[PDB]
Amino acid sequence: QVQLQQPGAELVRPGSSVKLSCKASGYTFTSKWMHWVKQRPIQGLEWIGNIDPSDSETHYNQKFKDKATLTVDKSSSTAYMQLSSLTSEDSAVYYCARGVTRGYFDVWGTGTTVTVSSAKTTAPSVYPLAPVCGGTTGSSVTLGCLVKGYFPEPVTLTWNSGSLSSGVHTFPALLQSGLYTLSSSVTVTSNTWPSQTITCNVAHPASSTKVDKKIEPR
Amino acid sequence: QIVLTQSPAIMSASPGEKVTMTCSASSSVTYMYWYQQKPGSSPRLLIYDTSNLASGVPVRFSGSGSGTSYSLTISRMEAEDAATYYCQQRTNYPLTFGAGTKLELKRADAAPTVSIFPPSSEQLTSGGASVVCFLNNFYPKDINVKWKIDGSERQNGVLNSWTDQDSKDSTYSMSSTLTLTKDEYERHNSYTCEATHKTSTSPIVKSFNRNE
Numbered sequence: 001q002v003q004l005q006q007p008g009a010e011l012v013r014p015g016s017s018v019k020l021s022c023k024a025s026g027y028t029f030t031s032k033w034m035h036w037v038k039q040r041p042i043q044g045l046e047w048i049g050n051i052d053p054s055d056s057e058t059h060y061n062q063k064f065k066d067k068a069t070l071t072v073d074k075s076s077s078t079a080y081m082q083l084s085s086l087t088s089e090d091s092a093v094y095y096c097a098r099g100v101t102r103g104y105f106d107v108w109g110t111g112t113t114v115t116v117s118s119a120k121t122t123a124p125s126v127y128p129l130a131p132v133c134g135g136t137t138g139s140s141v142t143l144g145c146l147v148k149g150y151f152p153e154p155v156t157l158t159w160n161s162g163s164l165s166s167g168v169h170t171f172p173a174l175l176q177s178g179l180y181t182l183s184s185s186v187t188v189t190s191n192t193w194p195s196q197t198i199t200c201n202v203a204h205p206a207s208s209t210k211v212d213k214k215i216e217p218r
Numbered sequence: 219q220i221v222l223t224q225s226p227a228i229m230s231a232s233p234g235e236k237v238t239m240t241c242s243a244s245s246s247v248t249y250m251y252w253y254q255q256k257p258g259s260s261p262r263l264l265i266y267d268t269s270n271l272a273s274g275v276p277v278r279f280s281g282s283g284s285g286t287s288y289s290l291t292i293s294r295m296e297a298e299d300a301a302t303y304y305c306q307q308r309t310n311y312p313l314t315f316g317a318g319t320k321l322e323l324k325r326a327d328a329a330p331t332v333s334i335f336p337p338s339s340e341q342l343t344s345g346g347a348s349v350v351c352f353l354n355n356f357y358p359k360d361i362n363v364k365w366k367i368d369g370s371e372r373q374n375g376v377l378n379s380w381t382d383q384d385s386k387d388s389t390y391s392m393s394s395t396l397t398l399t400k401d402e403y404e405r406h407n408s409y410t411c412e413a414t415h416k417t418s419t420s421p422i423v424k425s426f427n428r429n430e
Contacts (some may be wrong), residue, residue, distance in 0.1 A: 003225040040297045045261075045315040047255075063311055095260065103308040106272070108260040127338040129350060132426055142333040146350060148341070169354060172380045181377060182391045185333070186351045192375055 003108035004025035004096045011115050012086060020081040022096035022109050029034055030054060034079045035097040035105050036070065048094075050102070051079060059102070083114075091116045115152060118176035120139050123207040124150035124201070127217045141193050143186050143215050145200030149179040150207075158201045164188075222305040228230035230358070231326040232347060237292035239319045241305035243285075243334035250288045253315075257382045261304070263378070264288065275412065282417060297323065322359075327328040329417050330356035334410075334424040337403065347403035351394040351411030359383075359390045362414035364421070366426045368406045404428070 005023040012018050023033070035050040049060040053072045065092075071080045071174065083090060096109025130146030136142065147155055157170055164186065173182040184200070193199075194217050202211045221244045231237050231356045241250065255261040263272045265281040270286065276388045280291045290303060300323040305316025305348075337347040353361065359380065364374045377395040384390075394411060410425035 008220060044318055047313050048317070059311075064414075088369065103311070103313050104266055104306060105253075106263055108377065111260055125340075127340050129335045129336070132388075133430065142354075144333075144335055144350060144352065146338070146341075146348065148346075148348065166308070169352075169381060169391045171381055173390070174377055176377065181395070183350060183352075183379075183395065185354060185391075187354070206256065212241050 002107045004098060006096050006109045006112050008196075009113045009115070009153070011117070011121075012139060013118055014088070014116055016084055016086060018083045018086065018114060020083070020094055020112055021077045024077060024079065027098070029077060030104075031102070033099045033101060035099050035103075036068070036081055037095040037097055037105075037108075039095060039111075040092045050082070050099070052070070060071070078137060085117050086165070088116055090114065103172065112150070113153075117151075117178065119151050121206050122149065122151045122179060123209050124148075124155060124202060124204050124211065126202050126211040126213050128213045130215055131218045133218045135191070140187050141190050141191055143198060145184050145202070145213065145215075146204050147182045147202055149181070151179050152206060153180060155180075155182060156203050159186055160197070160199055161201060164198065172202075174182065175187060187214075219312060220247065220307055220310045220314060221314040222307055222314060224303075224305050224317045224319045224354075227317060227320065229319055229407045230324050231295050231321065232320040233295050233297060237295050237321070239292075240292045240323070241283075241290075241316050241319075241362050243288070243307065245310075246285050247307055248286070248309045250281065250283065251308075252290050253304040253306060255304065256301045266304075282307055297301045297385075307341045319421055322383055325338065325357045325400070327417055328355055328357035328389050328412050330354065330361065330415050330422055332411065332413055332422050334426055336409075336426055336428075342400060343404075344402045347398045347400055349396050349398070349409055351396075353392045353413055354392060355389040355391060355417055356417070357389050358416065360416065361390075363392075364414065365394075365396050365423075366408075366410040366412060368408045384399040 003026050010018050016195045033052050036048040036106040038046045048064045051058050051070050067085045069082045093111050093113050095111045098107045099105040125148050127146040167187040169186040173180040199212050199214050220351045224241045252265040254264050283289050299382045303319045327400050335350045344411045377399045407428045413422040
């Protein structure tokens with residue numbers, strides 16, 4: 001029923017501004033309070049402010065003035081949030097939230113990930129990782145696919161076009177001077193490799209890239 | 219303006235046993251609110267005004283407390299409960315959250331599996347050389363990595379990324395990657411990644427040679 005849809009990700013340079021929105025349905029928008037919450041990696045949830053469209057009431061966190069300017073649109077149906085300053089401090093996940101009066105929240109939005117960086121959008125690389133020269137110890141062989149130097153997130157990594165998914169560990173990317181680095185491991189038996197073909201597939205929507213790299217034995 | 223401290227920070231509980239999580243406030247508080255957030259999903263309201271339960275909340279969650287000390291109790295721990303839990307307060311505007319009690323599912327001690335990979339020829343073409351060491355399937359999360367080049371330890375240029383607890387076997391996995399230049403890589407021969415886990419004092423050692 002109650003759904004609070006908001007766009008995926010926004011990527012804006014330091015200094016400039018962002019206008020976040022929240023498409024609300026499943027309930028009467030003009031009846032219940034709309035709150036905004038900021039979540040950072042390892043610092044916890046931080047409440048920003050809240051608007052009541054009735055009765056126009058706009059509350060703010062004293063630490064968030066005047067970085068955030070909250071406005072609403074009734075048509076159309078949306079709740080807006082403009083971030084004015086934008087610094088490396090602002091890089092976080094911003095959540096839409098419905099609530100009945102102050103000050104707790106019932107339903108949360110999908111969340112928009114905001115990345116404040118001076119870096120430019122760049123294409124990925126993709127590298128094949130092969131085991132040691134000779135043989136692998138045991139019966140289970142381990143293969144990898146290293147993706148180094150790409151901006152921004154995300155990247156969809158699939159093995160064998162989607163035919164291989166069991167025993168796959170995809171590791172979250174880390175920021176390394178403007179460009180991300182991601183790795184993924186796969187564990188299969190020695191009877192499948194290198195007897196059958198194994199290929200890691202990486203696609204980046206922001207750069208329109210499609211790389212299929214075959215792991216050849218050393 | 220009240221500071222809320224949730225204790226403990228990381229919870230470890232086995233399925234089918236009582237779970238008591240606590241939040242502590244700086245000063246007197248009238249009503250408390252709790253929030254559940256599963257990995258890769260939006261948070262949701264669990265308990266409101268301390269005691270009462272939100273719609274859609276399974277019958278196993280309970281809340282109580284007063285003034286400064288408040289508690290969320292799970293009568294019987296289930297697999298779909300492994301999530302981060304957050305404190306929430308009013309009557310002091312803000313309107314602040316707690317640190318976040320991470321409820322992590324319990325598993326019988328697991329030993330890490332190590333696979334070391336030499337830098338690819340495609341990267342060595344560019345001038346860079348990244349040695350990747352995969353640490354797969356281990357319990358618990360806490361582990362130590364030690365990169366040794368020809369015996370000597372290296373600390374700068376090391377990248378370490380952990381995964382969230384698996385839904386099937388409930389084990390952690392991390393990726394250790396040391397980045398070096400083509401000049402720095404070819405000056406030395408032996409490259410070792412050591413895994414120091416709680417399961418065994420003896421480090422799990424996987425290494426290779428450059429000239430071979």
